Design an enzyme around this catalytic site. Structure first.
Site, short mmCIF file in Angstrom:
data_model
loop_
_atom_site.label_atom_id
_atom_site.label_comp_id
_atom_site.label_asym_id
_atom_site.label_seq_id
_atom_site.Cartn_x
_atom_site.Cartn_y
_atom_site.Cartn_z
N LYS A 18 0.82 -1.21 0.00
CA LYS A 18 0.00 0.00 0.00
C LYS A 18 0.86 1.26 0.00
O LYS A 18 0.62 2.19 -0.78
CB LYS A 18 -0.94 -0.02 1.21
CG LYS A 18 -2.30 -0.61 0.92
CD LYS A 18 -2.99 -1.02 2.20
CE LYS A 18 -4.47 -0.72 2.16
NZ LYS A 18 -5.18 -1.27 3.34
N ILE B 37 -12.37 -2.84 0.88
CA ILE B 37 -11.24 -2.32 0.14
C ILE B 37 -10.88 -0.97 0.76
O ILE B 37 -11.64 -0.39 1.53
CB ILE B 37 -11.59 -2.19 -1.37
CG1 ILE B 37 -10.34 -2.19 -2.24
CG2 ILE B 37 -12.35 -0.91 -1.62
CD1 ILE B 37 -9.64 -3.52 -2.26
N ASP B 38 -9.69 -0.47 0.43
CA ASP B 38 -9.22 0.80 0.94
C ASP B 38 -9.09 1.77 -0.23
O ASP B 38 -9.27 1.39 -1.39
CB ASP B 38 -7.87 0.61 1.67
CG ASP B 38 -7.51 1.75 2.62
OD1 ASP B 38 -8.29 2.70 2.80
OD2 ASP B 38 -6.41 1.69 3.19
N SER B 39 -8.80 3.04 0.07
CA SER B 39 -8.54 4.03 -0.97
C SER B 39 -7.22 3.76 -1.67
O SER B 39 -7.11 3.91 -2.89
CB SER B 39 -8.54 5.43 -0.36
OG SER B 39 -9.85 5.95 -0.21
N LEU B 40 -6.19 3.38 -0.90
CA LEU B 40 -4.88 3.10 -1.49
C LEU B 40 -4.87 1.78 -2.26
O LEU B 40 -4.06 1.60 -3.18
CB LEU B 40 -3.81 3.09 -0.41
CG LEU B 40 -3.52 4.42 0.28
CD1 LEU B 40 -4.30 4.55 1.57
CD2 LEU B 40 -2.03 4.55 0.53
#
Lengths: 61, 78, 92
Positions: A18, B37-40
């Protein structure tokens, strides 16, 4: 010999992927922020004095 | 069809990225509500799509798409 | 990890190796930083300097600056080799 070295939990590789994608998508601003912290470190450097006396680097007993 | 092949390629991407099986990745559910889910992680999907299956999705447009059907439609309209 | 795209190479090498190098840096850095409680001042100074420098090197330089320079310079990072920014776009 047995069952000793095995991977348990998957949470660090995902987070580091990430932050790697965060680096890749915006390489401009992250570089200028990191070099800004670098300059904050560097401006203290030219004012620097040493001490050659070890008497002040030991206890007093 | 083009739609199912694009869904298959995206599902391979999501399998490699966030460890979610391709069987229940369908265009009838959203990302952040159902797949967690994430933004990244959307940035991860975008970058991997850019290198592997060359097509350009810009910045400030990942947040426009919310479901898998939206993303596959966005790919096929180009 | 260049062949399947250059910057997917950065994200994949980061997820593969940044964890290991940051773990090693953090263990060695905190081992060196625990020297600060010593009654000998000079050993505490050396330990604190090395530890604080290793936190700075691990957390903000090697984790944020150097991959950013690699992703900004692009395919010119590997000159004189002729590398490609993206592979040939495979079909669906």
């Amino acid at each position: 010999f047995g069952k000793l070295l095995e991977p348990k939990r998957m949470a660090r590789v995902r987070g580091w992927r990430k932050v790697g994608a965060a680096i890749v998508r915006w390489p401009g601003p992250i570089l200028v922020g990191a070099v800004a912290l670098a300059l904050v470190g560097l401006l203290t450097l030219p004012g620097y004095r040493t001490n050659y006396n070890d008497r002040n680097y030991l206890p007093a007993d | 069809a083009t739609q199912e092949e694009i869904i298959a390629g995206l599902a391979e991407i999501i399998e490699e990225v966030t460890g979610i099986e391709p069987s229940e990745v369908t265009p009838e559910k959203s990302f952040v509500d159902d797949l967690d889910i994430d933004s990244l992680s959307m940035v991860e999907i975008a970058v991997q799509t850019e290198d592997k299956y060359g097509v350009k999705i810009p910045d400030e447009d990942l947040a426009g798409l919310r479901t898998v059907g939206d993303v596959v439609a966005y790919i096929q309209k180009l | 990890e260049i062949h399947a795209g250059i910057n997917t190479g950065i994200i994949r090498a980061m997820g593969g190796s940044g964890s290991v190098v940051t773990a090693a840096g953090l263990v060695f850095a905190f081992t060196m930083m625990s020297f600060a409680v010593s009654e000998l001042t000079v050993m505490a100074q050396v330990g604190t300097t090395i530890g604080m420098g290793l936190l700075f090197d691990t957390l903000i330089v090697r984790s944020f600056m150097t991959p950013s320079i690699a992703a900004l310079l692009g395919k010119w990072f590997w000159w004189p080799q002729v590398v490609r920014q993206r592979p040939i776009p495979q079909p669906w």
